Structure 1
Amino acid sequence: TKPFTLPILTISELTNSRFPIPIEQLYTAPNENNVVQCQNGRCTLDGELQGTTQLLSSAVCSYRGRTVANSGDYWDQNLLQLTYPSGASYDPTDEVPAPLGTQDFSGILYGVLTQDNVSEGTGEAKNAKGVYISTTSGKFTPKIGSIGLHSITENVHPNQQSRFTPVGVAQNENTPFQQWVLPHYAGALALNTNLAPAVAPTFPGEQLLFFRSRVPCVQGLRGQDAFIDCLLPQEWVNHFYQEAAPSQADVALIRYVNPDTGRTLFEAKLHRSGFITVSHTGAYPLVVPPNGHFRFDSWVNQFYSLAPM
């Protein structure tokens, strides 16, 4: 039986699985009213990708396809007829919530659309268009293969093969950024399908442990931080996919260790569905040694008692 392992990576060597930026810190908090059901960065410990999860950070919140004119709409002047960010054709009957890498938070995603290359004499950055992709728009239906593009300053051409590169997130006065409210992948008139399950602590005193990043915010949240919290770093997703080690229990005991001193800084529970819990009550940003990393200890029973941290 292939033993289960974690990659040996420090907190500065991890990528957020829900937005293509590095992990900044570990963070724990109670769920209070949030339903924690993100769809990117979802992978079982034995290597089954779930939700909209794929292997490349450069595909997370990225889109590719062909633009379609949508003149007359207030918000979305054009649509993007999607494929997978792979470039492989997208079939709405695929058993996924949306094309892999589709944004899994509610609100406005900001990025740059690139289209057919233009001549040098056309001018600077004339094949770059700043664009909003909002999930509250009626045209956000990636499950059906089409999303709406809100142009900001630059003209988006119809009928051109186009690539959307994410840059950050946005918040205006009627569209709050809500990282734990799933989009309606098929529009407000249809239920989501093929979702990775919601996660929550099930042992007394435990809280979810998140891998936290601050995403750039191009509008709103003055003096505040746009946080995107993921359950697994992209590197863990890819490691579990590569290894496909059979899971021997619902929960694995893991430790954050200093490899030079051998000290366990804290213990945590790694759950089969692909998330972590720690024994703590309250919102708490962890600070962890630059050389520290998680290590797999053993498979334990669901009601194993972690050392408080």
Structure 2
Amino acid sequence: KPFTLPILTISELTNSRFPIPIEQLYTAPNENNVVQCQNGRCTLDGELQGTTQLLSSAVCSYRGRTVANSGDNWDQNLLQLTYPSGASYDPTDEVPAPLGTQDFRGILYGVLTQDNVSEGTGEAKNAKGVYISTTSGKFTPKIGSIGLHSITENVHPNQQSRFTPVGVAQNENTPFQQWVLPHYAGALALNTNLAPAVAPTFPGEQLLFFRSRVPCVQGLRGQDAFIDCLLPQEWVNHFYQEAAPSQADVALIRYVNPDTGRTLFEAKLHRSGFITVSHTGAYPLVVPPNGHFRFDSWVNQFYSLAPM
């Protein structure tokens, strides 16, 4: 089977690390960042890695049964997890955490829904705003449990519950750090089964990211909470479907404008599932709204890209 990319414009792509559209392509040097996100990880021949699964609707979502955590002034309840599919989760599963688990340090914000309540109970009484913080000693998804900090109304214990992600938050002592992995089993345990860290090795090259702005419900005034993924969800899903054998270490890809039939820039798509471009410095790319990446040809790691 020949390798292909889906034909999708920038506005037709979903971030693989949070359920929101891709807004731009962005390149920057790694500097002191370890680029080792666990969602949106997939090889060109269709092998999913890290905590990656197929559904955008499962990314940073959680499902399970609540249990009371009385006396704890942050996490008043815990969530006993399953997979987002509803299937049973066990810590012995060869994954860093249940598939779709957040892969950034900090506070994830969203809404927990539980047992339905009568109409007369009031407006959105089965909707509880919650913070899921990785700096909490209760953030241990690998061992099947996470802490829920309710903002207003009490979360009920012993109810089948779904967490729907909305954005991130930054409070006075919990910075949002997109390139720092959570301790999936808590601070006393090492992470397991990780998709590897990625970096450019060819001189003059940098990683290219698919960038989104994630809503931020507390903090980052006059700033944007960026979440940067290595592959859009659509690319992950396409490689998984196709499972086309990789013919070389690198797929040469070009961003084309079908309205003009011209190539705007080119990039190297590595077999392990990330992109490099020829550029030095932090830079937001100008892409035409109707443009798209296309597979050009198989090359090796030594291919010298036209400066972008």
Task: Measure how far apart 1:302 and its partner are.
Answer: 0.8
Alpha-carbon distance between aligned partners in 2 of 1:180 and 1:154, rounded to the nearest angstrom = 32
Question: Greater shift after overlay, 65-74 or 233-242?
Answer: 65-74
Alpha-carbon distance in 1 for matches of 2:168, 2:282 = 23
SS in structure 2 of the partner of residue 273 of structure 1: coil
Deviations 1:83-111 (A, max 9, x none): 00000010111100000000000000000
The structural deviation recorded for 1:248 is 1.0
User: Whole-Å Cα distance in 1 between the matches of residues 300 and 243 of structure 2?
Assistant: 21
Q: CA deviation at 1:202?
A: 1.0
Q: Could you tell me how far apart the structure 2 residues matched to 1:87 and 1:169 are? A: 24
- Cα offsets for 1:149-170 (capped at 9, x unmatched): 0011011000000000000000
Deviation readout 1:248-281 (Å, 9 max, x if unpaired): 1111110000112221100000001100000000
1:134 equivalent in structure 2:
133
CA offset at residue 125 of structure 1? 0.2
For each residue in 1:4-23, what CA deviation from the matched residue of structure 2 results, as whole angstroms up to 9, or x when unmatched? 00000000100000000000
Is 1:211 aligned to residue 210 of structure 2?
yes
Give SS of 1:295's match.
strand
Please give the alpha-carbon distance, in whole angstroms, between the structure 2 residues aligned to 1:57 and 1:129.
22
Secondary structure at 2:234 match in 1: helix
**Cα shift at 1:220:** 0.2
Q: 1:283: Cα distance to partner?
A: 0.4
Q: Distance in 1 between matches of 2:303 and 2:52?
A: 29
CA distance, structure 1, for counterparts of residue 258 and residue 54 of structure 2? 28
Cα drift, residue 74 of structure 1: 2.3
Q: Following the alignment from structure 2 to structure 1, what is the Cα–Cα distance between the partners of residues 151 and 145?
A: 19
Q: Distance in 2 between matches of 1:272 and 1:135?
A: 31
Distance 1:73 1:249 in 2: 53
CA distance in 2, matches of 1:208, 1:215: 20
Supply the distance in 2 between the matched residues of 1:287 and 1:74 (Cα, whole angstroms).
47
Deviation at 1:33, TM superposition (A): 0.4
SS of 2:124 mapped into structure 1: coil
When normalised by structure 1's length, the TM-score is 0.99
Question: Deviation per CA, 1:193-248, whole angstroms, max 9, x where unpaired?
Answer: 00000000011000000000000000000000000000000000000000000001
* Distance (whole Å) between structure 2 residues aligned to residue 233 and residue 206 of structure 1: 20
Q: Does 1:194 align with 2:164?
A: no
> In the aligned structure 2, how far is the partner of 1:209 from the partner of 1:258?
19
1:60 paired residue number: 59
Partner Cα separation in structure 2 for residue 129 and residue 74 of structure 1: 16
Displacement after TM superposition at 1:291 (Å) = 0.7
- After superposition, the C-alpha distances for 1:175-210 in whole angstroms (9 at most, x for unaligned) are 000000000000000000000000000110000000
Give SS of 1:121's match: helix
1:304 deviation in Å?
0.6
CA distance in 2, matches of 1:251, 1:198: 17
Residue-by-residue CA offset, 1:59-89 (whole Å, 9 max, x unaligned): 0000000000001112100000000000001
Query: TM-score with structure 2 length normalisation?
Result: 0.99
Q: Percent identity?
A: 99
Give, in whole Å, the separation in 1 of the partners of 2:286 and 2:70: 50
| Alignment partners' CA distance in 2, 1:57 and 1:291 | 23
Aligned to 1:303: 302
Note the aligned Cα RMSD (angstroms): 0.5
